[PDB]
C-alpha cells in the first residue's frame, strides 16, 4: 500500500485515503448524542469505563461561556483542540466584549484543523466534536469532523454504533421545536439508549449530559445530577 | 500490452491478443456475434482493445450507492428467516465502503452467527453484530477513545 | 535542518536505534571500574599502541574536572563530544553552587543529554557508555554507569565493554569484602579481571586511580608490571 | 510508481496528483453558473444525506468581497479554505489599492495561488473546483472558473460537479446573451432538476440589477416559484 | 510468521471427514507461459470429482505483486495463474463445495478481487497471543520434560511477553537442551530463566517479527 | 534508485525530469510560431475554443509583459500564468531597480535562470511551459527568445512551440533560406501548411511589434481578416 | 518506513499503539487510592547482586504532595517529570497555593501526544514518550491517583496496575479493594507484588514503596520500615 | 545462501526452502545447517525457531586461537627453531583463520621453491608480504 | 520526502555506520603520503596523481597544505571535500590566535576539526567528509608531533602511520622509536615509497627549524634527485 | 525470430521479387525490427494520422450518411466540440446517437442526440 506515506497523496479514484480514515478513527470512539429544541440545546454522552472504575474519561467539556462541546475520538488531541477553541473564545470575550457566535467559532476551528490535512507529515486532528451553544438566534449544534467539514445539523449522534441512535433520532424530529427540558432530555436519553449492547441501563455513573440555552449557562450534569433524569423501560 | 521489449519481453500473449482483436475488428464479417467483456482493471490496456468499434460502450460499474446496499441486503437475505423488526436502511447507511459483494456476505455470516447463538431466527444485531466481523482487524486498549 | 524522526517506536515496543547503540557499545574496548570503599579504579584493555601509538592520545581514561573521571566504551569519537559538554556544564556547576561537583549530578547530566538525543529530530543517539566515578563533599566513592538509552545506574563493578559480560559475572563472583583495603587488593581485582580477557599488562592494560579528592594518577606500564607480577604469582 | 507526488512528472508529461484531484471533484454534486447581461446567477445542487441536517447545513454559495461569489464543487474543507483566503485577498486589495477589486485580477490571483500550491511534494493539490462571479457598474457580468490545476477561464455558462456531462448541454441550448436574469433564476431550476437523476434541496444566489453588486440567497420567493418546475 | 498459521491447517487436516488438497504457493510458478494456469484449472478439475472436498493454499504471497504496469512486465505470467485462480474461486459454476482455506503471512500484496468475500471471506488474524493465552501455549509444551515440583509459568509468560506463539517451543527445546547439558533429569527455573535470557534477549538482534507486524 | 523521480543525475547523464517536462508542453497543444521582420516581430499562434461556452476573449496565450515586450507560451496553461507573472515581476523590478525598461534578452535569461533553479534543486517540478517572447530595444533590431523548461534560451530567428514543432521549424527553415514586413506568406502559412486548416480569423492570435511603433499590439479579426484575405496570390 | 504522524489500518496511530508496548516491557508498579491516603509500590527489578539497589528511582516526588510512579521505558519520563515539577512550582509561584492532581496530570499529558517530524524548531520530540505513569497525590478534594497513558489519556483511578503485571495483578487488585486504608492496603498491595514475584521474595532491596497521606506530605519508605512490613507477611 | 546478482524467482525460491523446509511434516530432517556471511541480508522469515532452530556464532579469533590454530597446520611442517607469535598475534591486528592457513601454505611453499624442508622464519616474512602484505 | 533520504545517520544492525566505512574504502582507492617524525622535525612523503605531462606548476601541491607557521596537513580520499575543510580548519587556527595570541598547539586544532567532522556524521543528514587527512606540527608544550584522523572522527598520535592503499606494517618493523635522525627518516620514506620516483611522481615535504621559528620546506626538485640515487640496494 | 529470418530473407531475397509488393499495417511501430524497417524491406512508411478538423467532418458525414437525418444538422459544433477522435470513434458517435433514438423511440435523432452522443464518447478516454 504505497498510499501509506499519506496525507499528501490521493487514491486514484478521489480518495485522500487517511482523513476519511480519521473519520474511521472517530467511528471507533465512544457514542454520544446532542440535539436542539426551539429554546435550548442539549448534549448527552455515555462514558466508557475501560478500567477498574473511573470518572470514565469525562467527555463533554466546558469551553466557554455557553458554547459547550462533546468530544469523541482521541482525548489528548481533543484537549489540544479545546484549548485552542477555549483560548480564542476567551479572546473574543477580551477584544469585542460580546459572546463569540457559534458559527464563526466552528468555522475557524474548521479552518484550524484543516491545515494539517493540507501539509506534509502531520496527522489530522482525529476527534469528532459535537459542539453546541446558544448564540443570538436559536441554539445551534454542530458536528465537525477530522476531515475539517462541519455540519450545521440538528439532533446528531456520533461514536460507536451511533447510527442506530441516529435512526431512532431521525424518525423523532417532529417533537422537536417544542418539548421542554424535562421531557426533552428524556427524549435524548432514549435516543442514546440504543448504542448500548442491548442490556439495560443508562446508569448514573456513565451518563454525563450538558444543557445550554435561553437564560442558563452551559451546565454540566455529572454522576449525581443525572439521577433526576430517570425514565424509560426498554 | 505492447512495449519496447529488450532481453526478456513477451510475445505469446501478444499473439493471442493480436489474433483475438482481428477476428474481432479485422476484416468485415462481424455482424453475427456480440462480445461481453469484464475487467477489474482498465489502466493496463492499450487503445488497440479500445478502438471505438472493437469494444463499444465502456459501461461503468461504480460502488453500490447509498440505497443500493440496502437493496442487496434485501436480495441475498430473501431465503433467511428475518425478523419484522429489521431495518436494512441503517444497515446500509452505517456501513458505506463496501462494493456490494461484502453486503452479500454480511447477510450470510450474519445468519451464521445467528445460528452460532443457536436461535432458528435472525435479528438486527445479528446483522449489526455480523458487520463488526467483515473486517475487524482487532485494535483493543481503547478505553481512551473517549 | 534535517527533521526526519529517526529514533521511532517499531512494533513490540522495540526502539531499534537504541539497541543498535547497544551493539555499538558491545563492540568497543573493555572498560571496568571498582568502587573500592576509599579508592576508585578503572581499566581498559588497549590495543597495539606500543608498535607505533602515542600513549598520551589513546586515552580511554579522561578527566572531567579533578575528581570525577570517566571511561567510555564505544565509537570513541562521539564520546569526546560528551566529554566536552560534561566539562563545560561541570564548570557551570562550579559557577553557580561552587562545590567539588557531585558525581550524581554530572551523571544525571550525561544521561539526560543522551536521552535528549533519543528524542530530537534526526541525530542518532550516542553509542557510548560511561563509568562516572569520583567522590563528593564527604568521601563516598560513588560509581555510575550510563547507557545509550540515558539510564544511569549506581552500581559497583559495571564492566560494560566488549567482552565484559564475563568480567561482570566474574566481578559478581569475586567482590564481597576482600577489597575494602587501601589500593592493592582493589587494583589486583581489576588487573585480575582484565587479565581474564586478554594478555599481559606490558602491552595491553592501563589503569587510573583516584584518592579522596586529590591526585588523579594514571599508572605507567613500569608500575603496572609490579601488580601484574603479583597477580601472576598468586 | 510515478504517482503520489506533485513534483514528479509522468513519462509523457502529466502530473498525476492534479488529475487525481480533478476526479475528486467529479465525485461531488453540481453547481452551475449562468451569465447574462444583468449579472451572474448561481445554482448549487444539494445532496442532503439525512433529515438531521438543517437548511444550509453546509454553505456552498459563499461570498468573498460583498460582490463576487463562490459556487464550489469538491472538498468543502479545501473550498472553504480558499474561500476565506479569497476574502483576505480582496481585503488586501481594498485595503491596499482602495479601488474595489476587479474580478479578473482576483481570479488570476487565486488561480496562481492554487497553481503555485501544486509545485511541491510538501503540499497536496486542492481538491475543489469553484467559480466566481460579479459585475461592477462598468465591468460586465464577469465570472471565472478555476480548476485544481490552477487554470482560470472566463465563461458564460460553466458547470462543475458530477453531472457536468449532462449540465453543459442544457446551458448550451439555453438562450445565453440577452435575457434579464429573473427568468434565468427560474430557468436554473430546470437545469438542476434535469441533472438530478435520483432530496435535491437546491440553493440559488446571484448578483444583478435587482442587487446592485451584492449577493442574496434568493430572496426567498423563487424557492416556491422555481419549485413549480417539477413535472418537466 | 510465528503463530500457528499452518498448525491450524494441520489440525483441520487431522480431522476433516473429507479430502485435503494441500497446494503450496510455488507448485504453480513453473516456467512455461500459461502452464501455471494449466495446473490450477487442472487442480480444480480433480477437485470437483470428489464430493465434500476442500483445498489449502500455503504461502499465497508467492502469487501476488498486485497488478503491475505494462512496461518492464516481469510478474505477468504469475499474474495470469493467480487470475485463473480467482476465476475458479468465483465464476460460472454450481461450484461444488470446495471449502478453500488459505494461509499467508502477508496482507495487501494480495490485491483485491481475491480477498473480497466470495473467494476468501472470514479472514482470521493470528495476532501474537496475550499474557493469558501465552501461558497456555507453554502449557502445551509442558506436556513433557519432567519439570521441577513448583514452576512459575506466568512468570515465563511475563518475561518474553511479546514473543510469538510458535517459538516458546524454542524456549521449551532450548531449556531442555540446558537441562540435558547440565546432566539433570529435571528442568528448574533458572534454566527456563536461563533460556529466556538466551532466545529472547540474544536472539532478537537479527530475528525480526516487527518487520512483519508492520505488514500484519 | 530515484532517477525518474527526482531531478538528479541518472547514469550516462540525462536527468529524467526535463524531457518529462518537455513532453508536458505538448499536452493538448495550442501552437505558436513567431515571425521576425527586419522591422517588425509579428506573433502567431493557434487557439481553439472547445464548445462556444468559454469566453473567447478571456482564453488566450498572448500575454503582455510591459509596453515593449510581449510573450506567448504553449505549455500546460496551469504553469503558464505562474511563469508570466514572475516575468512581469522581474520586468517591473528591473525598471525600478536599474532605471531603463528591461531589454528582451536578459529577461529571458532571468526566467530561464529561475527555471534552472527549478531543475537544480529537488522538491519542485520544473514547470512545463516555454516562453516565446519578442521585443525591440534601441540598439538592435526586433528580437525573439524562447526559454525552455530547462532554462536554455537561445536567441532565435524562427522556431515554434507546442505540438507539431518539428514540421513548423522544417517549414520555416525551408522558407528562410530563400532570403518581409507584411509576413503574409510566412506567419499564417506555417500553420496552414503544417496542420492544414486555412483558418477563419477567429482561432488565430497575432501579436506584432514594429520598429516604428514598439508598443506590443494584439490584433483583432478586422486586421487579421485583411491579413488572411491577403493570402490570395 | 512511513513516518510518525500516520494512522494505522486498525484505527489508531502507529506510534501510539506502539507506545502502548514497551510498557509491558519494564518493571511493574501499583497504586491504591484510599480514603486516608494513597500507596505506591514498584518492584524495580535489580539485575545483578554485585551492586547498589537504592538508586533506581521509580518513585519520584513531583511536589511534597504529588508522587509519581513510572515504568516502561525508564528515564524517558525525566523530561516530563521535569515539566511536572517546573509546572508545579510555576503554579505555586503565580497562584500562591497547592495544586490538584488533574492540573499536573493535565499539564504532563499535553506533552504526550505532542511530537512530529516536520514542525517547529528541533527542540521538539520525535517519538512519543514511551513511559506510563501515575501521580499519587492528596488534594483538598481527596487523595486520588491519575493513571496516564503514552497517548495523553489520563483517568481517575483508585486501584491501578502498570508494567508487565497489567493483567494478572490488575485482575487480582480488582477483587481485593473496596473499603479504605486502615494501614492494610499497603500490606495487601505488596501481597500482590508477592504473587507477581520474578526473581526474589520481595525483601527491602528490590521493591520501593511510598505513601502519600493527608496529614503528612509524603513518605518515601526507608529500609527498616519496608522490612518491618515484610516481616508482617 | 546469500542470494545476490528477475528478483521474484529468487523470492519464490527462498519461499520454497522456507515452506519445503516446514510445510506439513518432516522425516529425520535435522541438518538444515546454513553457513552465512551476511545475516542482516536474508529475509528474517527462515527463523520461526521452527523453520530454523537454535543457532550458534562466534567472534573471529582471539589470540589464544591464533596460537592454538596456528600450531595445527605447522605441526605438519618442519619449522622448529623460531616458531613465533610476535609475527602472528599483533602482526595484522587480527588475521583470519585462513590467513594462517595461507601463511603456512605460502610459507612452506616459498621455502620449498628453493628446495629445503628447513625452518627459516625470514622466508616466512616473504610469505607474509606475499599473501596479505 | 522520507522515501528519498539516503539516511546517512543510521546505525547498522551490526552497530556500525554505513556512510562512514564507505569513506574508509574511499581512502584505499586514492591515498599515499606517509609521515615520519624524528628527534628533529617531521616530514610528509606523498604521491601525485599519474604520469600525464600536461601539468605546468604547483606552488604547493594538491597534497601538502600550509596551516600556520608551525603546522601543515596532507590529504587522502576525495580531494573536493577536504580543500573546503582545510580552509575551514585554517580559520580555526587563526581565530585561536585571535583569542589567545598563541600559535595554536596542534592537538587543539585536530580536536576542533574532528569535532566538526564528527558533527557532520552526527546529524544534518549529509554525507560525511570523505577524507582521512593527517597533520604535522609543533608547539612549545610538546615536541615535534604528527596526528592522524579519519572520516569517523577519532584521531591519534600516529608516529609513522601512512594512509591510503597498501597498509604501513613494514614501518612497524623498521622505525626506531627513540632516535631517528631525520636524514635517515628521509631514507626510510623513500624506502617505503620505493616499495609502494623523481618529483614528477612524488611529493615529499619536510618540517624543520632554525633558531626557534619553524621552517616548512617542500623539498624542491634536485633534492629528490639526490635521494633517489641514495640507495643502491634497499 | 527464425520465421522473421525467412520472411526477411525473402522480402530481401537475392532478387527484388520484381513483380509483387507487400504492405503491412500495424500499431506500435516502435517495437518493430530495425532489419525489417531499413528502406528496402519497407520503403515508404506511411503515417496515417487522426482526423484533424476537415477529416473529422468527413468521417462524420460518411458515417452519418445512411442514417436518416435532419437538414441543417449542426456538424460544425460536433467537429468543433472535442478533437482527438478516430474514424471508429465517430461511427461510435453516430452509433450511440442511433442507439439513443432506438431506446428513446424517435424518428431519426435530434441535434441533442449527436450532442449527447459525443459527450459520452468524450467520457470514453483511456
mmCIF file of C-alpha atoms in Angstrom, chain A residues 31-175:
data_model
loop_
_atom_site.group_PDB
_atom_site.id
_atom_site.type_symbol
_atom_site.label_atom_id
_atom_site.label_comp_id
_atom_site.label_asym_id
_atom_site.label_seq_id
_atom_site.Cartn_x
_atom_site.Cartn_y
_atom_site.Cartn_z
ATOM 1 C CA UNK A 31 -21.013 7.103 21.453
ATOM 2 C CA UNK A 32 -22.773 10.385 22.172
ATOM 3 C CA UNK A 33 -25.823 12.360 21.074
ATOM 4 C CA UNK A 34 -26.708 16.027 21.023
ATOM 5 C CA UNK A 35 -29.876 17.756 19.886
ATOM 6 C CA UNK A 36 -31.636 21.118 19.914
ATOM 7 C CA UNK A 37 -35.050 22.496 20.811
ATOM 8 C CA UNK A 38 -36.623 25.782 19.799
ATOM 9 C CA UNK A 39 -35.226 27.243 23.040
ATOM 10 C CA UNK A 40 -32.288 25.262 24.446
ATOM 11 C CA UNK A 41 -29.955 22.619 23.002
ATOM 12 C CA UNK A 42 -28.780 19.595 24.974
ATOM 13 C CA UNK A 43 -25.842 17.190 24.848
ATOM 14 C CA UNK A 44 -25.815 13.625 26.219
ATOM 15 C CA UNK A 45 -22.802 11.327 26.433
ATOM 16 C CA UNK A 46 -22.129 7.823 27.701
ATOM 17 C CA UNK A 47 -18.664 7.403 29.160
ATOM 18 C CA UNK A 48 -16.660 4.212 28.661
ATOM 19 C CA UNK A 49 -15.072 2.528 31.694
ATOM 20 C CA UNK A 50 -12.077 0.577 30.390
ATOM 21 C CA UNK A 51 -10.569 0.140 33.853
ATOM 22 C CA UNK A 52 -11.303 -0.838 37.476
ATOM 23 C CA UNK A 53 -13.687 2.097 37.707
ATOM 24 C CA UNK A 54 -13.101 5.728 36.966
ATOM 25 C CA UNK A 55 -14.678 9.017 36.019
ATOM 26 C CA UNK A 56 -14.873 7.006 32.790
ATOM 27 C CA UNK A 57 -12.857 9.543 30.752
ATOM 28 C CA UNK A 58 -15.235 12.512 31.001
ATOM 29 C CA UNK A 59 -16.351 13.500 27.519
ATOM 30 C CA UNK A 60 -18.404 16.692 27.382
ATOM 31 C CA UNK A 61 -16.332 19.774 28.054
ATOM 32 C CA UNK A 62 -16.608 23.344 29.306
ATOM 33 C CA UNK A 63 -15.029 25.612 26.678
ATOM 34 C CA UNK A 64 -16.823 28.692 27.053
ATOM 35 C CA UNK A 65 -19.478 30.861 28.479
ATOM 36 C CA UNK A 66 -22.389 28.859 26.789
ATOM 37 C CA UNK A 67 -20.598 27.173 23.793
ATOM 38 C CA UNK A 68 -20.094 23.627 25.075
ATOM 39 C CA UNK A 69 -18.571 20.617 23.357
ATOM 40 C CA UNK A 70 -18.708 16.807 23.305
ATOM 41 C CA UNK A 71 -15.549 15.028 22.199
ATOM 42 C CA UNK A 72 -15.369 11.578 20.651
ATOM 43 C CA UNK A 73 -12.033 10.244 19.436
ATOM 44 C CA UNK A 74 -8.526 10.939 20.685
ATOM 45 C CA UNK A 75 -8.537 12.609 24.083
ATOM 46 C CA UNK A 76 -5.214 14.467 24.152
ATOM 47 C CA UNK A 77 -5.855 15.791 20.658
ATOM 48 C CA UNK A 78 -9.366 16.751 21.771
ATOM 49 C CA UNK A 79 -7.927 18.649 24.728
ATOM 50 C CA UNK A 80 -5.486 20.434 22.418
ATOM 51 C CA UNK A 81 -8.352 21.443 20.140
ATOM 52 C CA UNK A 82 -10.463 22.711 23.023
ATOM 53 C CA UNK A 83 -7.554 24.687 24.441
ATOM 54 C CA UNK A 84 -7.484 26.349 21.032
ATOM 55 C CA UNK A 85 -11.267 26.819 20.870
ATOM 56 C CA UNK A 86 -11.316 27.816 24.538
ATOM 57 C CA UNK A 87 -8.484 30.328 24.236
ATOM 58 C CA UNK A 88 -9.799 32.203 21.244
ATOM 59 C CA UNK A 89 -13.360 32.148 22.574
ATOM 60 C CA UNK A 90 -11.930 33.959 25.593
ATOM 61 C CA UNK A 91 -10.021 36.174 23.160
ATOM 62 C CA UNK A 92 -13.349 37.184 21.618
ATOM 63 C CA UNK A 93 -14.549 37.858 25.160
ATOM 64 C CA UNK A 94 -11.487 40.074 25.554
ATOM 65 C CA UNK A 95 -11.475 42.127 22.376
ATOM 66 C CA UNK A 96 -15.028 42.524 21.094
ATOM 67 C CA UNK A 97 -16.644 42.075 24.551
ATOM 68 C CA UNK A 98 -19.530 40.085 23.168
ATOM 69 C CA UNK A 99 -20.285 36.349 23.186
ATOM 70 C CA UNK A 100 -18.455 34.812 20.259
ATOM 71 C CA UNK A 101 -21.113 33.451 17.879
ATOM 72 C CA UNK A 102 -21.184 29.704 17.468
ATOM 73 C CA UNK A 103 -20.953 29.697 13.665
ATOM 74 C CA UNK A 104 -17.720 31.685 13.466
ATOM 75 C CA UNK A 105 -16.343 29.534 16.285
ATOM 76 C CA UNK A 106 -16.959 26.267 14.461
ATOM 77 C CA UNK A 107 -15.868 27.758 11.135
ATOM 78 C CA UNK A 108 -12.478 28.929 12.320
ATOM 79 C CA UNK A 109 -11.731 25.668 14.069
ATOM 80 C CA UNK A 110 -12.876 24.190 10.763
ATOM 81 C CA UNK A 111 -10.024 26.226 9.288
ATOM 82 C CA UNK A 112 -7.643 25.303 12.115
ATOM 83 C CA UNK A 113 -7.960 21.517 11.819
ATOM 84 C CA UNK A 114 -7.809 21.918 8.028
ATOM 85 C CA UNK A 115 -4.135 22.931 7.916
ATOM 86 C CA UNK A 116 -2.571 19.525 8.837
ATOM 87 C CA UNK A 117 -4.872 17.881 6.289
ATOM 88 C CA UNK A 118 -3.154 20.126 3.758
ATOM 89 C CA UNK A 119 0.539 19.942 4.572
ATOM 90 C CA UNK A 120 3.123 17.193 4.941
ATOM 91 C CA UNK A 121 3.774 14.625 7.650
ATOM 92 C CA UNK A 122 1.108 15.972 10.009
ATOM 93 C CA UNK A 123 -1.838 13.828 11.038
ATOM 94 C CA UNK A 124 -5.340 15.321 11.090
ATOM 95 C CA UNK A 125 -6.959 16.103 14.412
ATOM 96 C CA UNK A 126 -8.607 12.728 14.869
ATOM 97 C CA UNK A 127 -11.537 13.852 17.010
ATOM 98 C CA UNK A 128 -15.197 14.351 16.187
ATOM 99 C CA UNK A 129 -16.541 17.322 18.080
ATOM 100 C CA UNK A 130 -20.269 17.653 18.646
ATOM 101 C CA UNK A 131 -20.295 21.286 19.731
ATOM 102 C CA UNK A 132 -23.472 23.023 20.864
ATOM 103 C CA UNK A 133 -24.208 26.560 22.013
ATOM 104 C CA UNK A 134 -26.785 29.335 22.205
ATOM 105 C CA UNK A 135 -25.923 32.489 20.268
ATOM 106 C CA UNK A 136 -28.345 35.342 19.429
ATOM 107 C CA UNK A 137 -30.715 33.150 17.391
ATOM 108 C CA UNK A 138 -31.691 29.553 18.243
ATOM 109 C CA UNK A 139 -29.335 27.157 19.985
ATOM 110 C CA UNK A 140 -27.145 25.748 17.243
ATOM 111 C CA UNK A 141 -25.425 22.392 17.250
ATOM 112 C CA UNK A 142 -22.508 21.457 15.013
ATOM 113 C CA UNK A 143 -20.935 18.172 14.293
ATOM 114 C CA UNK A 144 -17.479 18.800 12.996
ATOM 115 C CA UNK A 145 -15.158 16.083 11.818
ATOM 116 C CA UNK A 146 -11.459 15.290 11.359
ATOM 117 C CA UNK A 147 -11.991 15.929 7.639
ATOM 118 C CA UNK A 148 -12.498 19.612 8.651
ATOM 119 C CA UNK A 149 -16.037 19.649 7.232
ATOM 120 C CA UNK A 150 -18.520 20.759 9.872
ATOM 121 C CA UNK A 151 -22.289 20.396 9.593
ATOM 122 C CA UNK A 152 -24.964 22.787 10.784
ATOM 123 C CA UNK A 153 -27.117 19.897 11.949
ATOM 124 C CA UNK A 154 -29.878 19.256 14.412
ATOM 125 C CA UNK A 155 -30.027 16.106 16.552
ATOM 126 C CA UNK A 156 -26.792 14.345 15.570
ATOM 127 C CA UNK A 157 -25.213 11.221 17.074
ATOM 128 C CA UNK A 158 -21.582 10.197 16.571
ATOM 129 C CA UNK A 159 -19.494 7.408 18.049
ATOM 130 C CA UNK A 160 -19.570 3.642 18.329
ATOM 131 C CA UNK A 161 -22.696 2.150 16.676
ATOM 132 C CA UNK A 162 -24.297 5.613 16.832
ATOM 133 C CA UNK A 163 -26.070 5.013 13.524
ATOM 134 C CA UNK A 164 -28.874 3.225 15.366
ATOM 135 C CA UNK A 165 -29.198 6.269 17.629
ATOM 136 C CA UNK A 166 -29.470 8.407 14.505
ATOM 137 C CA UNK A 167 -32.199 6.204 13.057
ATOM 138 C CA UNK A 168 -34.109 6.495 16.277
ATOM 139 C CA UNK A 169 -33.441 10.206 16.301
ATOM 140 C CA UNK A 170 -34.241 10.761 12.621
ATOM 141 C CA UNK A 171 -37.780 9.397 12.971
ATOM 142 C CA UNK A 172 -38.432 11.538 16.070
ATOM 143 C CA UNK A 173 -37.709 15.040 14.818
ATOM 144 C CA UNK A 174 -41.402 16.024 14.768
ATOM 145 C CA UNK A 175 -41.498 16.572 18.548
#
